[PDB]
DNA sequence: TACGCAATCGATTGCGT
DNA sequence: TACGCAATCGATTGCGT
Ligand code: HPA
């Protein structure tokens with residue numbers, strides 16, 4: 187079709203090309219003619235033809251986990267914004283924590299020759315670590331590790347441990363000493379890391395968390411429901427709960443309310459994520475906020491760099507959580523005594 | 525690189541190719557050699573090279589609106605599943621209801637030569653209608669109209685009017701006659717359509733909805749908050765509210781609770797969407813369920829058809845809403861009198 | 863029998879004149 | 880000065896032998 191254009195305008199295609207990309211000077215009339223031909227023919231240059239010739243697709247691949255979950259969804263949207271903004275195209279892939287799915291998506295990606303790769307796989311067993319190295323040639327940034335687990339990628343780190351600690355401290359500072367916790371999968375950063383930060387704050391305070399008070403969630407509302415229920419279902423119950431993710435938390439409120447428990451009058455609850463609509467939870471959720479957007483932009487930024495400035499050295503940038511006081515926490519029995 | 529392979533295996537590339545695609549018979553040894561070469565060289569065939577030669581990219585484009593919103597997010601995830609499943613690649617684009625953004629994304633899409641297009645633009649002013657026609661050559665399905673607004677696309681229709689009516693009736697059947705409503709943007713199907721279905725049920729019942737009882741939302745939690753508040757902020761208030769979308773609804777619960785209003789003891793509320801976590805709203809939300817997944821799969825299916833079976837005629841399939849009884853509705857003053 | 867030649871798909875870009 | 884020739888980017892596939 188570029189031939190079709192040239193001919194209509196009676197110039198070579200080389201010409202058509204340069205005018206299309208302003209890649210060299212072209213006489214007005216000439217330009218005009220080309221433009222005209224372009225219009226009638228209703229021409230749209232193939233980006234594939236071009237990608238073949240130039241050696242880059244101007245498209246980036248997001249190897250995600252799931253995309254419905256608030257947390258993820260929020261990140262992804264951030265990511266797309268940046269792509270769009272710098273003319274990149276986004277290929278979204280959810281491997282659902284499945285190796286096969288993940289091997290598959292990784293292959294299509296390389297095949298489709300994506301300029302770079304955004305990685306959000308949640309859990310990283312060796313085998314996954316392995317595959318990724320196998321593709322170290324395509325530039326990539328992992329967005330969900332707590333620390334850099336490989337020299338062949340860039341990493342954006344969230345300080346989930348310091349976020350967990352922040353959560354514990356708050357409770358402690360508000361008068362609590364009988365706390366429970368519902369963490370996310372230990373196989374994840376946002377899971378293991380948040381817990382531990384939180385646990386350090388407890389040891390520091392000589393607070394012991396009875397194992398019947400720790401219940402594993404999977405970041406899903408239903409998981410928060412079951413755990414909360416199991417915690418309050420007990421003879422002896424905490425006066426406060428630390429829930430590893432806002433969504434699971436929303437599930438914890440439900441249950442409490444279903445047991446006719448008052449939040450935060452009968453139980454205080456603090457989340458983690460500060461998902462877009464946590465403020466509208468009932469009650470407005472107190473939580474630790476994760477800078478999801480900066481988390482996306484920053485990742486996209488390292489990618490571009492590696493891409494354009496052709497950096498070779500793995501890099502890593504940290505981002506920081508922060509506390510958001512809303513209304514699910516109330517003073518505890520020991521407030522007055524500090 | 526395909527040359528590199530051939531040579532290592534001392535066969536032509538034609539050979540390499542057929543073995544790679546099992547496109548014709550190849551001697552065992554031969555196959556073997558090729559496979560071997562493929563391995564050492566660590567070969568990944570360019571899908572772009574191939575797309576150029578075959579004339580299809582095996583990738584589909586989703587021209588969305590936003591992707592964080594529960595409703596959307598849920599659809600998109602459905603969509604990706606199907607792509608993956610039939611080997612398609614997904615390009616996600618959010619035009620945020622912006623013509624320019626939308627013209628831009630549409631262009632990149634054509635340029636990237638996507639096999640088909642999935643359309644979710646929410647609002648369709650003429651100008652948008654115009655652009656789309658300009659690309660009628662690339663196959664496409666609109667997923668959010670209430671009726672077919674063009675002969676050049678396939679359409680999947682949701683019966684949002686019958687869903688709205690379902691909502692009104694429920695209330696009526698539960699004893700209510702003083703109702704308010706918070707609809708989504710009238711410029712959208714899910715907005716205008718739901719309202720009207722709902723309004724028909726009212727006229728049928730000789731119920732009049734005082735304009736101070738209808739407050740426009742934008743499907744966002746904050747919008748539900750403000751509206752609910754404005755409704756209950758009044759001297760005279762309804763005993764029941766019909767909220768146009770679960771998320772805005774979640775915002776309505778918040779407000780009520782903030783005004784110390786009881787749900788559904790002081791006010792009954794019914795949503796629309798049956799978003800993944802409406803069951804965990806506090807209280808568990810009664811709502812109209814939209815078959816989001818079938819909505820995605822069905823769309824993807826029409827697309828494939830047009831694509832493969834090269835259909836030319838616009839088609840349109842309807843999907844159906846249904847009621848989900850949870851706990852935000854309570855009997856009304858007139859229950860006993862029917 | 864089993865495989866290879868050469869032209870094609872739509873663009874870019876270094877030499878030239 | 881302002882533009883064009885021809886080779887290249889990585890694959891497919893119809894004829895042949
Ligand atoms: O893995 C996760 N899933 C869902 N929400 C989350 N918030 C933090 N981590 C996660």
Ligand code: HPA
Pocket residue numbers: 593595596646708712714715743769797
């Ligand atoms: O346009 C919409 N936006 C968000 N949620 C929705 N649910 C129905 N329609 C919509």
